Amino acid sequence: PPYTIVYFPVRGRCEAMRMLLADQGQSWKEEVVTIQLPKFEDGDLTLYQSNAILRHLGRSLGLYGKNQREAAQMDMVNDGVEDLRGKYVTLIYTNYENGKNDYVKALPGHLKPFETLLSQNQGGKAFIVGDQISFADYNLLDLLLIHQVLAPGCLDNFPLLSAYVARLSARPKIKAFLSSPEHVNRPINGNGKQ
Amino acid sequence: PPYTIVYFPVRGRCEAMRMLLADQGQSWKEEVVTQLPKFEDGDLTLYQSNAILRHLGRSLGLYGKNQREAAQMDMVNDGVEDLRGKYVTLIYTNYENGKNDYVKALPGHLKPFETLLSQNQGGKAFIVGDQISFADYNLLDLLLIHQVLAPGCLDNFPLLSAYVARLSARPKIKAFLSSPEHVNRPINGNGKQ
């Protein structure tokens, strides 16, 4: 510490890290830019790449599992989350009008794997991997929230993902963040589409 | 262990992990298919090429010595993966028309790696720290295929040019790169490169 996030006036690739810091009871400075990013500072350490930052917070704050297997599975989940996020960004910023239809029908095929993982872990009553929350949970949660906005009801056929979202969102510190002015008045994406 | 790699018959996203295992003197079995790659390490099954590289980094001790090195390594690999993703898109989606634009923008993407090397012992060691990491194996693979895509792309980058030559000379990697299994495997699945 101290922590500082330098990024555009959007939720984009930073909401996950913001919810993580909030939930872990940490404070941070927010530096807004208009026109890579985000840049993150942790005392003397400067970082780039939202996932490099998430893993760094996972390591230092104890949100990276308890062993090799969990660490490996968490990486797997995050990589998957990032693959869908990359597709999403492409839609939003380059083929929203035409591509939206195709994306939404294909969407359920991408969520299924996460539903499967949840069922395999304590009947989807705990976290994505293990018995404790990890950096991966915050990233997945964010991915699900913006998708519900992109296509309402996309989680209808997924009772575990659906429950998981309500469960995590109810966590007091996260609930406060999601209700915060900073969060509420910030668009999901930089182009007004979502 | 044992180690098994299930993947299509291409270099693609698996050559980095193959060079890593070879260089670490480990043995493995290839299971050719025509999402992958799937990798098995004893009772552990993994998917996602980068999740696999990180696991090999953790278990084999190629993930740095501290928090700072681990974070810088993640940063570098993420950088490598961004360029690789663009590369894949070119090769499989807009090769004919898009090749030119790609090659031109290319030097802009390499500069940051050159810069990183200059900062680390005058680029005479590894990408991060004084020891090879899972990140070096990935970066090196990315550089090798780019020299194929655009010969001379490393001309304006003496530190990267030296780095490639240096790491390619490591005995076990040199042996691997000269192996038939590597030699008779297309870089990509569509014949373009």
| Residue B147: both structure tokens together | 């020299």
Q: Closest CB to B70: pick one of A49, A59, A76.
A: A59
Are the C-beta atoms of residues A7 and A182 closer than 8 Å to each other?
Answer: no
> Is residue A112 less than 8 Å (CB to CB) from chain B?
no
Best of B38, B48, B84 to substitute, by most chain A Cβ atoms within 10 angstroms, is: B48
Q: What is the CATH number of domain A64-171?
A: 1.20.1050.10
Which architecture does CATH list for B63-170? Up-down Bundle (1.20)
Count of CB atoms situated within 10 Å of the CB of A74: 26
The set of residues, in sequence order, having a beta carbon less than 8 Å from that of B13 and lying 6+ positions away, is B7, B37, B49, B84
| Fold topology of A2-63+172-193 | Glutaredoxin (3.40.30)
Residue that has been written with the tokens 């490639």 in this structure: B164
Beta-ladder partners of B30: B5
Q: Which residue is closest to B58 within chain A, CA to CA?
A: A68
Q: Which residues of B touch A86 (CB under 8 A)?
A: 85
Give contacts of B 75-94 with A, CB under 8 A.
75, 78-79, 85
Parallel/antiparallel/unpaired status of strands A29-32 and A3-7: parallel
Technique used by the depositors? X-ray
Dist CA A60 CA A52 (whole Å):
12
Report the first-to-last Cα separation within chain A, whole angstroms. Answer: 33
Alpha-carbon distance of A60 to A48, in angstroms, equals 16
Helices A159-169 and A135-150: crossing angle in degrees, nearest 10, is 110
Name chain B contacts of A76, Cβ cutoff 8 Å.
46-48, 51
Give the best residue of A47, A69, A76, A77 to mutate against chain B (max B CB count within 10 A).
A76
* CATH superfamily to which B2-62+171-192 belongs: Glutaredoxin (3.40.30.10)
> Rounded to whole angstroms, how far apart are CA atoms A85 and A103?
12
Q: How far apart are CA A23 and CA A176, in angstroms?
A: 9
Question: Is residue B54 exposed (0-12), middle (13-18) or buried (19+ Cβ within 10 Å)?
Answer: buried
Measured in angstroms, the resolution is: 2.0
Distance from CA of A34 to the nearest CA of B (A): 22
Three-state DSSP at A130 gives coil
Which residues in chain B touch residue A71, judged by CB atoms under 8 angstroms apart? 54-55, 58
CA distance A173 to A175: 5
Per-domain residue ranges of chain A: 2-63+172-193, 64-171
Contacts by B11-15, CB closer than 8 A, 24 or more apart: B11/B141, B11/B145, B11/B182, B11/B185, B11/B186, B11/B187, B11/B188, B12/B187, B12/B188, B12/B189, B13/B37, B13/B49, B13/B84, B14/B49, B15/B141, B15/B182
Alpha-carbon distance B161 to B167, whole Å?
10
Tokens of A42: 């942790």
In this complex, which of A49, A72, A80 lies closest to B55 when CB atoms are compared?
A: A72
Domains B2-62+171-192 and B63-170 share a fold: no
A6, A33 in Cβ contact below 8 A?
A: yes
CA dihedral A61, A65, A68, A70 (to 10 degrees): -150
Give φ, ψ of A67 to 5 degrees: -160, 180
Cβ-based contacts of A72 with chain B (< 8 Å): 44, 46, 51, 54-55, 58
Which residues of A are documented as binding site for glutathione? 7, 13, 36-37, 49-50
- Using CB atoms, pick whichever of B44, B75, B85 lies closest to residue A72: B44
Q: Please tell me which of the candidates B59, B71, B79 has its beta carbon nearest to residue A68.
A: B59
Do the chains contact at A80 and B50, CB–CB below 8 Å?
A: no
Q: If you compute the radius of gyration of chain B from its CA atoms, what whole number of angstroms results? A: 16
For residue B123, give every residue at least 6 positions away whose Cβ sits within 8 Å of its Cβ, in sequence order, or none: B114, B117, B159, B162, B163
Contacts of B54 in chain A (CB under 8 A): 71-72, 75
CB neighbours of residue A66 within 10 Å: 12
Residues of chain A positioned with their CB less than 8 A from the CB of B46: 72, 76
Residue indicated by tokens 């070119």: B90
Annotated binding site of A: 7, 13, 36-37, 49-50
